[PDB]
């Protein structure tokens, strides 16, 4: 029950390049993890 924790700067800031680089990567990470890591990981520690 928390937002795991702070860090002020891990964010977005959405513009440029630096939006696909943010977003790019948390997309494909979903895309990548979602259905194959979150799987293997499920069995497998860490």
């Given at each position: 029950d928390a937002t795991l924790?702070?860090?002020?700067?891990?964010?977005?800031?959405?513009?440029?390049?630096?939006?696909?680089?943010?977003?790019?990567?948390?997309?494909?990470?979903?895309?990548?993890?979602?259905?194959?890591?979150?799987?293997?990981?499920?069995?497998?520690?860490?």
């Amino acid at each position: 029950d928390a937002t795991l924790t702070e860090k002020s700067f891990e964010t977005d800031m959405n513009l440029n390049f630096q939006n696909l680089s943010v977003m790019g990567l948390r997309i494909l990470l979903l895309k990548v993890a979602g259905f194959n890591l979150l799987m293997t990981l499920r069995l497998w520690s860490s």
